């Protein structure tokens, strides 16, 4: 998957991330750019407009939890399958969440990281993160049956 220079650059950039704000903002953007994804959160309240979504505390709170697990996954870049196995079985058997949502969240995350770091989210850094979000998507999807 990642070369060692890629592993390094990812860790390097992650350590400057405020996982709380980035998670809220990513899930927020997910619900706004791909509205059908709101289907899993009707109990979150007002998701009627973009600021209503980005401002929604349940969206923000779920975003933080989700990106937290993701973040914890960045310490398992050698066996993401193993680290998300439980969360994968959960998202399938219990939450009935279509894995494509994990890929859509992945790209929104990449756009958020780019938006936050500007110039520093270099083409090479992005390439490394594309490998990671694709790995986390596949790992999360690994157990669906």
């Amino acid at each position: 998957h990642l070369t060692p220079e890629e592993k390094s650059a990812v860790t390097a950039l992650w350590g400057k991330v405020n996982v709380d704000e980035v998670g809220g903002e990513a899930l927020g953007r997910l619900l706004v750019v791909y509205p059908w994804t709101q289907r899993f959160f009707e109990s979150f309240g007002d998701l009627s407009t973009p600021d209503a979504v980005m401002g929604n505390p349940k969206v923000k709170a779920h975003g933080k939890k989700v990106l937290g697990a993701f973040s914890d996954g960045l310490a398992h870049l050698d066996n993401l399958k193993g680290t998300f196995a439980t969360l994968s079985e959960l998202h399938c058997d219990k939450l009935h969440v279509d894995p494509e949502n994990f890929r859509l969240l992945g790209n929104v995350l990449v756009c958020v990281l780019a938006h936050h770091f500007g110039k520093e989210f270099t083409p090479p850094v992005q390439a490394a993160y594309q490998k990671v979000v694709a790995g986390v998507a596949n790992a999360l999807a690994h157990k669906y049956h």
């Binding site: 750019v33 791909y34 509205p35 059908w36 994804t37 709101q38 289907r39 399938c92 009935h96 969440v97 279509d98 894995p99 494509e100 949502n101 859509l104 999807a141 669906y144 049956h145």
Partner: protein, 141 residues
């Protein structure tokens, strides 16, 4: 866009499906749940076992929408508007799934239409299923 030869082809193939549309609809769904297990995340309320009544009933509705699309093949955005709304506003099945079902419907037709599933008809049905899908997701955002 569907050409004159495309429509002739769809109509010929679908015409031969005839009374079996419901059954074929159900078989394509089973093929889909079996081949693409992530598609089952949209039916947690269905007993999905072979021959279930829920799946049988749903296949008939899917094949009936298609049979309607063929009958209104030059006016699909309108003939499928209600269904399109249903999918964009409530079901919200992610778009990548229509291709999976479309593939399983083509496989189901192939399996059943030895004489009619020529390279040409296969090309036209694919374009048709792709067009029905685009209409069904056209209002997603």
């Amino acid at each position: 866009v569907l050409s004159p030869a495309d429509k002739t082809n769809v109509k010929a193939a679908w015409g031969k499906v005839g009374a079996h549309a419901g059954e074929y609809g159900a078989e394509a769904l089973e093929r889909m749940f079996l081949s693409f297990p992530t598609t089952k995340t949209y039916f947690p309320h269905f007993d999905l076992s072979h021959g279930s009544a829920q799946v049988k009933g749903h296949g008939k509705k899917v094949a009936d929408a298609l049979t309607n699309a063929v009958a209104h093949v030059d006016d699909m955005p309108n003939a499928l508007s209600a269904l399109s709304d249903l999918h964009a506003h409530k079901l919200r099945v992610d778009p990548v799934n229509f291709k999976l079902l479309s593939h399983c419907l083509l496989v189901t037709l192939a399996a059943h239409l030895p004489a009619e599933f020529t390279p040409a008809v296969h090309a036209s049905l694919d374009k048709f299923l792709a067009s029905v899908s685009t209409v069904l997701t056209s209002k997603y955002r």
